[PDB]
Design a protein around this motif. Structure first.
Motif, mmCIF file in Angstrom:
data_model
loop_
_atom_site.group_PDB
_atom_site.id
_atom_site.type_symbol
_atom_site.label_atom_id
_atom_site.label_comp_id
_atom_site.label_asym_id
_atom_site.label_seq_id
_atom_site.Cartn_x
_atom_site.Cartn_y
_atom_site.Cartn_z
ATOM 1 N N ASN A 254 0.813 -1.211 0.000
ATOM 2 C CA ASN A 254 0.000 0.000 0.000
ATOM 3 C C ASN A 254 0.850 1.266 0.000
ATOM 4 N N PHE A 255 2.059 1.168 0.537
ATOM 5 C CA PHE A 255 2.957 2.303 0.613
ATOM 6 C C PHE A 255 3.784 2.432 -0.655
ATOM 7 N N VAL A 256 4.392 1.338 -1.090
ATOM 8 C CA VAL A 256 5.090 1.325 -2.367
ATOM 9 C C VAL A 256 4.160 1.779 -3.482
ATOM 10 N N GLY A 257 2.986 1.177 -3.570
ATOM 11 C CA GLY A 257 2.007 1.588 -4.550
ATOM 12 C C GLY A 257 1.585 3.039 -4.436
ATOM 13 N N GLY A 258 1.233 3.486 -3.240
ATOM 14 C CA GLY A 258 0.755 4.840 -3.056
ATOM 15 C C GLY A 258 1.799 5.889 -3.355
ATOM 16 N N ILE A 259 3.001 5.692 -2.838
ATOM 17 C CA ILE A 259 4.131 6.568 -3.138
ATOM 18 C C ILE A 259 4.430 6.603 -4.630
ATOM 19 N N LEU A 260 4.261 5.472 -5.305
ATOM 20 C CA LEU A 260 4.408 5.472 -6.743
ATOM 21 C C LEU A 260 3.366 6.393 -7.353
ATOM 22 N N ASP A 261 2.225 6.541 -6.694
ATOM 23 C CA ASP A 261 1.161 7.387 -7.215
ATOM 24 C C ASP A 261 1.047 8.690 -6.438
ATOM 25 N N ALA A 262 2.057 8.991 -5.635
ATOM 26 C CA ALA A 262 2.162 10.277 -4.951
ATOM 27 C C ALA A 262 0.905 10.655 -4.198
ATOM 28 N N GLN A 263 0.311 9.661 -3.561
ATOM 29 C CA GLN A 263 -0.818 9.877 -2.688
ATOM 30 C C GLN A 263 -0.318 10.040 -1.284
ATOM 31 N N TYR A 264 0.487 11.071 -1.083
ATOM 32 C CA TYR A 264 1.065 11.353 0.221
ATOM 33 C C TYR A 264 0.042 11.796 1.269
ATOM 34 N N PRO A 265 -0.937 12.642 0.896
ATOM 35 C CA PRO A 265 -1.952 12.962 1.896
ATOM 36 C C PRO A 265 -2.516 11.720 2.565
ATOM 37 N N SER A 266 -3.046 10.826 1.746
ATOM 38 C CA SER A 266 -3.649 9.594 2.209
ATOM 39 C C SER A 266 -2.703 8.782 3.080
ATOM 40 N N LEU A 267 -1.491 8.534 2.598
ATOM 41 C CA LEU A 267 -0.542 7.741 3.370
ATOM 42 C C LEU A 267 -0.138 8.453 4.649
#
Ligand SMILES: [Zn+2]
Ligand SMILES: [Zn+2]
Ligand SMILES: [Zn+2]
Lengths: 569, 569, 131
Positions: A254-267
């Motif tokens: 979820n972190f590797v994926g999200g960071i790949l998609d620059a969803q920093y707010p969410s993470l």
């Protein structure tokens, strides 16, 4: 009144006074999203948002911007949902208008993966994915899984015509040695690129500073190398020197994926007030897509994110995205027996629904290739399959036999793989997720239809709706017609895989996020390596040996079937 | 007496009492090298070493071990060199003996890169490379350059028949989707592997612990990720926490390359008593080769490192090695004008030597494909080329005109590239390095024959010697017959590149290490990125634009030629 | 040196793949001895040769190569060419793509090796047997 106004807005054509818009540019996207929100802030009812739209549209904002923004608005709107008003079909987009030009089938234009065009151009795949990015805790994990999964299917489809395996975009100085040319009805709005195009190292000279923020190549390469080197260390560095985010087998994807998609707010909401270092890990996925659009730009004008799946290079990009999945998956294995269901699986079968064609056989199903709907921007063919079903026998194992008073409740997970690609975790294609509840000590035969798949988008061809599924639809599901890999004329061997898990006890979020909710991790059990195989000592172990061992792992059964190709003129 | 004893030893066949030997196993290699040294310690003359050999051979040491060990001994022996006794031709190896089986040309066996077999099986390429690893400050840099360079040629040769570009072995869980089957005269001694073989994750179960140290996959992957993440940080960690080795634009490739080849002794001599952390960076190249041999093992027996270039997978491995070159090259750019020679280049030409075939033209040369020498283990063809030459005009620029009393001395560097692969630094193939000395203010036309190339091995086909080059030979040079990429029947476009550099002032080491000595870095100017392009701000810059600008960079000239394919029965 | 065969994408066009069949040693020895042997002499000639045609066409279909076009028109081209295995090329050679019969005669071929049988004469026999 309201759905008409909507179709009106989506039909609006970009003109020459409009501020240029780049639907693949992160900055332009941030702007677009702000216009989305801008609508939501105009009221709780649709008429409120739609007014804000006409308002802005008169003030000459870009019609393509409004479509991505009105789409996102319509998709997340309680009012819209309950009034069952949705973003229109992809067909209503302007590029579906202008002699009807067909496609060019010539020995000069079928080199490379050009043959997989029927798949990449397929209308229902494009509508699915178009609506998908309008929808989008697990946001990283879904992004990464969904895209890894349609990569696995595309590679398999590749193997079916005996085309070479896709070479990932792992080296950013790589060539696109084949080129790409949209179907002739789209070439007008946008075009492609020639053989051996690359990313621009620094910038496209002829592409305005208004359409594109200069992201040179070496910057993306830095992010890449930075994420690579995190995954290995096990942590993502935080804005604060001594409090990294530690990857766990549960959070990792979820972190590797999200960071790949620059969803920093969410993470960031899960770091206890720390933030991830955005300067270090960047926005690799969206900028990377940005570099491809940049590469194909020719002399600003407006670019939409229309028809991403069509471009052969986005599938080379999604293959690179998958690499991060491959890296993280074997760093954090899982026990395959960890969530076994107290049950025994037997007799896994994939059948045609119509068994009255003798000589017929169990485990011999059939796909067909018919004509492309040219007016739906399809090329080369329109895949489909004769209706299939799978079944498996399930008999209980529990000390306390299942009774009407105390049901055993388990989940059955159906995956398939090309026999060739079987020993790779990431090539297994998810086909169903089904809940079984037992009330006897006796065996049952659970039957699942193709049209009931938890993976499938519940519509007929070209977005025609399913009565049975007025509620669910799953417009952004995997198309029904593309559920089966195409196969070979000879009957291509595939392997089917069923596992039974105890998931209990669980609460699927509200739309439009109900669909990917899975207590086990999406794609389980193939989303992480198996601690059976990483910690193997013999050397003899493989996915193959494990999912054939019905004695040692009785909650796993596998069987072999054959998919048969066919043309239907 | 002595050369006979040598041919005797090299002819010895492995029997069933011999301790099994794995010429691709690092451990076995360390043992082999110790036996090499063991010979050298038996005296300063050959008879001394050769006695030690018969001695050990009677004590039943492995004949294949003795060949790699007697080969290395013979190659570095002052006595041997001066007596011009060498390791025999590859032909004298036992596997060149057993009806003569040919190759199988069938529509079932030409899938993938099987067509490039004539190149990979070519006898002179195999003898060259066989002797090369008997030879081997710049040891890392040479390993990395040589292998990157024969990758560039293999990829180009691939493009010539319009085969897909080679997919690097960058993901270690990748499939070898084509398989490999040695020519039928070699299948006896060793065999290949089937379609979609992979590395064993942990170990080959059927392969003895005597032949193979268990190096599971995840360990190699760790080294990889560790070297990756060093190159980016800029340093290689040392045994001592606060004194890393910092990569400089000058050291970078020799260290990346050497560490890839686990030549820590050699590198350690430049750290001022520190050591590189061998636990961190491992021995990725040699163990990686070890994993391929492991994969193909079938049931110990003896494995030689015979015919590495033959196996299609070693070229996928060398492509991965090249990736480390690509990573480091753009991290440490160089000024293209930094070592310019005060001179102006004009009129670069690649010609046939035989110009009396009108209609003939400048810049239209010719290769041919004739029959394979089956008794030299060749398959499919034996490439060759009609004799070529290149010339360029060189006229001086110096404030002080060149005079018999004060020569201008410069170096001309000849590279070619497939027009398609032109804007990639690493696809340029080095073709010549030639010293020019000017004594006038006037222009000259420098002519270089193909047979005089600084890159070429100075022999005729099948190791037949060149009178003109009794001294140099360069047995481990690039074969003459494979100097020209094969081309296309239509005339494939290539680009030629000449740069003039001021190298002065220099001292080539003693044999057998005289050959790769280059003050500028081997492969200059294409071994590192150009600071012209990394620091470009327009976006318009490319290798193309730079090497066409004769005004701004007059010490660089380029020209376009065409290579024409041909069959000669 | 033992020359092998040239397997190259430039030399596998046409029916070149059926070379293993046409070059096969036991087929060649068989047929070599056959014409040393040879009431039913016409019937055997015609049957034997029709029969190894049927097999060759079938073998053709097996690799999905096109069906063989009969030499029924004598002004037809041999559009593929032929080049013997490299160990035979010495003794005799082949011909290039799109070779035809010589209408009248091969100019460079001695009157000692070849009686001039122009094309139209053979065509006459053909048409005469047909009719
Ligand atoms: Zn997407
Ligand atoms: Zn080598
Ligand atoms: Zn006959």
């Amino acid at each position: 009144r309201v759905s008409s106004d909507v179709r009106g807005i989506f039909a609006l054509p970009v003109q020459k006074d409009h501020k240029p818009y780049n639907g693949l540019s992160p900055e332009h996207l941030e702007t677009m999203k702000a216009v989305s929100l801008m609508l939501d802030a105009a009221g709780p009812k649709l008429e409120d948002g739609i007014s804000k739209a006409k308002e802005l549209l008169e003030e000459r904002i870009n019609p393509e911007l409004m479509r991505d923004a009105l789409g996102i608005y319509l998709t997340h709107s309680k009012d819209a949902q309950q009034r069952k008003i949705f973003p229109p079909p992809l067909k209503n987009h302007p590029f579906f208008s202008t002699n009807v030009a067909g496609e060019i089938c010539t020995a000069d234009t079928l080199h490379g993966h050009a043959l997989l065009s029927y798949w990449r151009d397929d209308y229902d795949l494009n509508d699915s994915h178009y609506y998908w990015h309008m929808v989008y805790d697990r946001h990283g994990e879904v992004f990464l899984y969904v895209h890894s999964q349609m990569v696995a299917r595309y590679e398999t489809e590749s193997l079916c015509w005996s085309l070479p395996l896709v070479r990932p975009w792992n080296q950013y100085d790589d060539f696109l040695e084949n080129g790409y040319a949209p179907i002739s009805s789209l070439i007008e709005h946008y075009g492609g690129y020639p053989p051996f195009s690359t990313w621009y190292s620094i910038r496209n000279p002829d592409m305005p500073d208004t359409l594109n923020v200069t992201i040179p190549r070496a910057r993306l390469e830095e992010w890449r190398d930075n994420i690579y080197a995190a995954i290995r260390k096990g942590q993502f560095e935080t804005t604060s020197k001594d409090k990294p985010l530690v990857l766990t087998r549960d959070n990792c994807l979820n972190f590797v994926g999200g960071i790949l998609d620059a969803q920093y707010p969410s993470l960031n909401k899960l770091l206890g007030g720390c933030s991830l270092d955005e300067e270090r890990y960047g926005n690799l996925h969206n900028y990377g897509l940005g570099k491809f659009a940049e590469m194909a730009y020719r002399n600003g004008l407006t670019i939409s994110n229309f028809g991403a799946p069509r471009d052969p290079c986005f599938w080379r990009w999604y293959k690179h995205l998958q690499y991060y999945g491959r890296l993280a998956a074997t760093r954090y294995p899982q026990d395959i027996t960890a969530h076994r269901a107290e049950v025994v699986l037997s007799n896994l079968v994939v059948r045609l629904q119509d068994r009255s064609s003798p000589h017929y056989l169990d485990g011999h199903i059939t796909t067909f290739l018919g004509p492309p709907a040219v007016n739906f921007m399809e090329s080369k063919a329109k895949l489909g399959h004769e209706p299939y079903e799978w079944n498996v026998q399930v008999k209980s194992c529990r000390r306390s036999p299942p009774s009407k008073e105390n049901p055993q409740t388990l989940t059955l997970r159906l995956f398939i793989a090309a026999e060739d690609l079987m020993n790779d975790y990431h090539s297994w294609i998810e086909m169903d997720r089904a809940t079984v509840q037992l009330t006897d000590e006796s065996a049952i035969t659970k039957v699942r239809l193709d049209t009931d798949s938890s993976v499938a988008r519940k519509m007929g061809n070209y977005g025609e709706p399913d009565p049975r599924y007025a509620s669910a639809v799953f417009r952004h599901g995997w198309p029904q017609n593309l559920m089966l890999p195409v196969g070979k004329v000879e009957g291509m061997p595939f392997v089917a895989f069923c596992i039974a898990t105890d998931d209990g006890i669980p609460p699927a979020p509200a739309p439009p996020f109900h669909h990917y909710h899975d207590p086990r991790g999406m794609g389980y059990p193939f989303n992480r390596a198996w601690t059976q195989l990483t910690e193997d000592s013999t050397g003899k172990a493989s996915i193959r040996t494990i999912i054939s061992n019905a004695e040692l792992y009785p909650f796993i059964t596998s069987t072999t079937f054959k998919i048969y190709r066919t043309t239907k003129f």
